[PDB]
Design a protein around this nucleic acid. Structure first.
Ligand SMILES: Nc1ccn([C@H]2C[C@H](O)[C@@H](COP(=O)(O)C(F)(F)P(=O)(O)OP(=O)(O)O)O2)c(=O)n1
Ligand SMILES: [Mg+2]
Length: 321
DNA sequence: CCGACGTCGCATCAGC
DNA sequence: GCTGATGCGA
DNA sequence: GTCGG
């Protein structure tokens, strides 16, 4: 809303930095600028006005001015029309093709999906799956399908061993009406910090033809593809699903962290610091009088975490910030 | 001025 | 063959 | 690219 022309511009600049110039920190700077401007509840009229916001500096101020006085950025217009740069940027939309792989492909004349299709031999396993489901991976998932997906996942996990605890986290857990993928956090009492749990779950999901492809799989993280059964109806798009096995004594921290939002974890993180706490994905530890965290504390639900920091439970419904 | 800017699991590469 | 580095996505 | 030490 409000400054979509500006934030589209900035996001576009961000992508070229990451994908073409391989400048991760500029990618991040542009996205911060785009994010702070997106939340600005006013129609921006000058670069100076924008510069007042944290993350918007002299150069972005200048870019805004040019956009506001012409309706575009010369550099961006040039970048878009550059065959090499535009191709490198495009190829990274394929899961598994990052900035480096895109650059190599474009160097050797491989620039479109058709070219990718023509050169399967030059693609690793992940990249082939990314190519296979290029279109599907870019679709969002309606909440109703996410629930249908949740039904299958919770049912099959409990079927393998009823002592598993499984939680669908991510935007879905925050009640969002659509998701980009499904994230499943999994634990089991026989698995602690101190102490084939994941393989067995993946195998069951494959057995009932829910999981269709594997991108990567180790003892704690699975990254793959799944698909709901089809009704005389259109088949469902294939969807990205992740499954993480976490020790029970870190599980609820993990659930918090992987539920988001990113901005919420930000805000909640600093609060821990104020009251002398370093919360990371895994644990919560107290900062001694020097900057020295001690042991991780007991955590046996999300709330235990809120309590250590004298917060009251925020239902995931409102963890947008 | 100049460095920081977030982190990790898995797949694959580079070097030995 | 092994160990550490790099690429990648989240 | 922007920030801050
Ligand atoms: N650079 C990154 C990016 C992400 N993540 C982790 C940390 C996040 O908890 C997790 C998902 O971030 P997400 O990018 O899918 C999102 F924020 F858009 P979400 O709202 O969760 O969308 P959805 O629920 O539909 O998948 O990836 C990370 O660790 N590093
Ligand atoms: Mg996601």
């Amino acid at each position: 809303t409000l400054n979509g022309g500006i934030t589209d511009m900035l996001t576009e600049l961000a992508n070229f930095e990451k994908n073409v110039s391989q400048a991760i920190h500029k990618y991040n700077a542009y996205r911060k600028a785009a994010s702070v401007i997106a939340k600005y509840p006013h129609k921006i009229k000058s670069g100076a006005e924008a510069k007042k916001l944290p993350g918007v500096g002299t150069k972005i101020a200048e870019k805004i001015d040019e956009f506001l006085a012409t309706g575009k950025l010369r550099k961006l217009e040039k970048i878009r029309q550059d065959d090499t740069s535009s191709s490198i940027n495009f190829l990274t939309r394929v899961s598994g093709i990052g900035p480096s792989a895109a650059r190599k492909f474009v160097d050797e004349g491989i620039k479109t999906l058709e070219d990718l299709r023509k050169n399967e031999d030059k693609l690793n396993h992940h990249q082939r799956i990314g190519l296979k489901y290029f279109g599907d991976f870019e679709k969002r998932i309606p909440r109703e399908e996410m629930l249908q997906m949740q039904d299958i996942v919770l049912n099959e996990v409990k079927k393998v061993d009823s002592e598993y605890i499984a939680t669908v986290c991510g935007s879905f857990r925050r009640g969002a009406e659509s998701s980009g993928d499904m994230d499943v956090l999994l634990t089991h009492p026989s698995f602690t910090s101190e102490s084939k749990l994941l393989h067995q779950v993946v195998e069951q999901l494959q057995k009932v033809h829910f999981i269709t492809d594997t991108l990567s799989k180790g003892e704690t993280k699975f990254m793959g593809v799944c698909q709901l059964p089809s009704k005389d109806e259109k088949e469902y798009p294939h969807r990205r699903i992740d499954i993480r096995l976490i020790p029970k004594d870190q599980y609820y921290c993990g659930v918090l962290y992987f539920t988001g939002s990113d901005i919420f974890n930000k805000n909640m993180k600093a609060h821990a610091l104020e009251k002398g706490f370093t919360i990371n994905e895994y644990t919560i530890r107290p900062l001694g009088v020097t900057g020295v965290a001690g042991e991780p504390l007991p955590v046996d639900s999300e709330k235990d975490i809120f309590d250590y920091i004298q917060w009251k439970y925020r239902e995931p419904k409102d963890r947008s910030e």
